[PDB]
């Protein structure tokens, strides 16, 4: 019943069906582990197929307080209230939850996207206007018997996946689940201890990988890297792929790269390995990212004599973001109860006949350094 409860469009997030209000109003809601506010369109907008109509809900309560949330991409403002909320293809429960009713927005809603709101699944510490605004998942756990854990299987124009609330579905992964500690409960903050491209260590002090934090963020498309790390990674991927020369704009995500249909030279692009801090001192495991993940297909019938891609690795001034292109093809367990994130190869894993995405360990390092930036 919870399997295949996510849909989406490539590059535009993954969403789950929800209802708000009494009687229930059905909305599609983007699943975002990178923020902590539940917010829904609540006024007409050119890109909204539908919106929350507070006047039609008998259970709506105005909190008489406005709220503004600026993401990396897009921003919105709205009015806080509470109302009853369900998830038709999740646990059969009804929870009263905080809801920001979006009345104004800028570059938030996406033309043709199919979602009308966002579900911030991270912790209260980053909720706006402040941490007293209890996030949705906290309310769900407090009000029901749902275990304090959820798991995401994001699959690679239309895409799909599963959000399993309150548990782990073993049919969605193979091999072992490897856990990395949640360093601080605000974002889902983790620690990267090593980065390799084409098996070659980037050779930086490991704190650079976590400047100034590293997070797991289903609401962000790309792998985003601190400038120093980004520049080193791009240099190494360029070197690996030097049999072909792409315009500088491709590497900056400003331009597509296109090949005749069916002829994408996957083999010239390297595998990227991200080593995550283990649960035991100086131990780690790695997740390996194939080019089928970090070259994001851009669907466009106009260009359809070709396969065209955007480089889905980009620069960040706010730390590492392991976004959707990293999560796709892994089964990712947000084990809040035990303050850890689990990774396993998912049933929808990425692979060709030569290489496959992997989650593998353990690895040991002799270096005693804490890789946390703070």
**CB of 363 or CB of 373, closer to ligand CM7:** 373
What distance lies between CA 288 and its chain's CA centroid? 16
Q: How far is the CB of 119 from ligand CM7 (least distance, A)?
A: 10
Q: Which stretch binds ligand CM7 (CB under 6 A): 17-25, 147-155, 215-223, 342-350?
A: 215-223
Alpha helices in the chain, H assignment, sequence order: 136-143, 227-240, 248-251, 291-294, 324-327
Instruction: Examine residue 320 and tell whether it contacts ligand CM7 (CB under 6 A).
Output: no
- In 3D, which of 51, 179, 61 has the Cα closest to residue 108? 51
Let me know if 262 is exposed, middle or buried by CB neighbors in 10 A (0-12, 13-18, 19+): exposed
Say whether residue 32 binds ligand CM7 (CB under 6 A): yes
Residue 205 annotated as catalytic: no
213 binds ligand CM7 (CB under 6 A): no
Residues in binding contact with ligand CM7, number by CB under 6 A: 23
CB 322, min distance to ligand CM7, A: 11
Q: Tokens at residue 368, please?
A: 């005693």
117 binds ligand CM7 (CB under 6 A): no
Residue 217 falls in the annotated catalytic set: yes
Interface with ligand CM7, residue 72, by CB under 6 A: yes
Using the rule CB under 6 A, is 35 a contact of ligand CM7? yes
Among candidates 295, 356, 349, which has minimal Cα distance to 325?
295
| Angle at the Cα of 248 from the Cα atoms of 242 and 253, rounded to 5 degrees | 110
Residues between 91 and 110 that touch ligand CM7 (CB under 6 A):
108
Q: Which of 21, 78, 91, 219 binds ligand CM7 (CB under 6 A)?
A: 219
Find the part of the chain contacting ligand CM7 (CB under 6 A) among 8-16, 44-52, 168-176, 271-279: 8-16
| CA neighbor of 223 nearest in space, from 276, 295, 153, 294 | 294
Q: Please identify, among the stretches 88-96, 157-165, 217-225, 352-360, the one whose residues bind ligand CM7 according to the rule CB under 6 A.
A: 217-225
Alpha-carbon dihedral angle through residues 51, 13, 359, 289, given to the nearest 10 degrees: 180
Place of tokens 């359809």: 304
- For the bound state, the minimum distance from the C-beta of residue 321 to ligand CM7, rounded and expressed in Å, comes to 7
Rounded CA separation 173/195 (Å): 24
Nearer to ligand CM7, 162 or 222 (CB): 222
328 binds ligand CM7 per the rule CB under 6 A = no
The enclosing H or E element of 316 equals strand 313-316
Which positions are catalytic?
32, 217
Residues binding ligand CM7 (CB under 6 A): 11-13, 30, 32, 34-35, 69, 71-74, 108, 118, 126, 217, 219-222, 224, 314, 323
């Amino acid at each position: 019943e919870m399997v295949d409860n996510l849909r989406g469009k490539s590059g535009q997030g993954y969403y789950v069906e929800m209802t708000v209000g009494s009687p229930p109003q059905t909305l599609n809601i983007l699943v975002d582990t990178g923020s902590s506010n539940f917010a829904v369109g609540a006024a007409p907008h050119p890109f909204l197929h539908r919106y929350y109509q507070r006047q039609l809900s008998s259970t709506y309560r105005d909190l008489r307080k406005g709220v503004y949330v600026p993401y990396t991409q897009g921003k919105w403002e709205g009015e806080l209230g509470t109302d009853l909320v369900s998830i038709p293809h999740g646990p059969q429960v009804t929870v009263r939850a905080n809801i920001a009713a979006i009345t104004e927005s800028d570059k938030f809603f996406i033309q043709g996207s199919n979602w009308e709101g966002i579900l911030g699944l991270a912790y209260a510490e980053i909720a706006r206007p402040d941490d007293s605004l209890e996030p949705f998942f906290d309310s769900l756990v407090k009000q029901t018997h749902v275990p304090n854990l959820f798991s995401l299987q994001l699959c690679g124009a239309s895409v799909g996946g599963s959000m399993i609330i309150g548990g782990i579905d073993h049919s969605l992964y193979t091999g072992s689940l490897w856990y990395t500690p949640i360093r601080r409960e605000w974002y889902y903050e983790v620690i990267i201890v090593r980065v390799e491209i084409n098996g070659q260590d980037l050779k930086m002090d490991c704190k650079e990988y976590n400047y100034d934090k590293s997070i797991v963020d289903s609401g962000t498309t790309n792998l985003r890297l601190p400038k120093k790390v980004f520049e080193a990674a791009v240099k190494s991927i360029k070197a690996a792929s030097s049999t072909e020369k792409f315009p500088d704009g491709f590497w900056l995500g400003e331009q597509l790269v296109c090949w005749q249909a069916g002829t994408t030279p996957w083999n010239i692009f390297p595998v990227i390995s991200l080593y995550l801090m283990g649960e035991v001192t100086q131990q780690s495991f790695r997740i390996t990212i194939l080019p089928q993940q970090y070259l994001r297909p851009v669907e466009d019938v106009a260009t359809s004599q070709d396969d065209c891609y955007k480089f889905a690795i980009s620069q960040s001034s706010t730390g590492t973001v392991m976004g959707a292109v990293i999560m796709e093809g892994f089964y990712v367990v947000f084990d809040r109860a035990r303050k850890r994130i689990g990774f396993a190869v998912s049933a929808c894993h990425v692979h060709d006949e030569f290489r496959t995405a992997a989650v593998e360990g353990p690895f040991v390092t002799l270096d005693m350094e804490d890789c946390g930036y703070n």
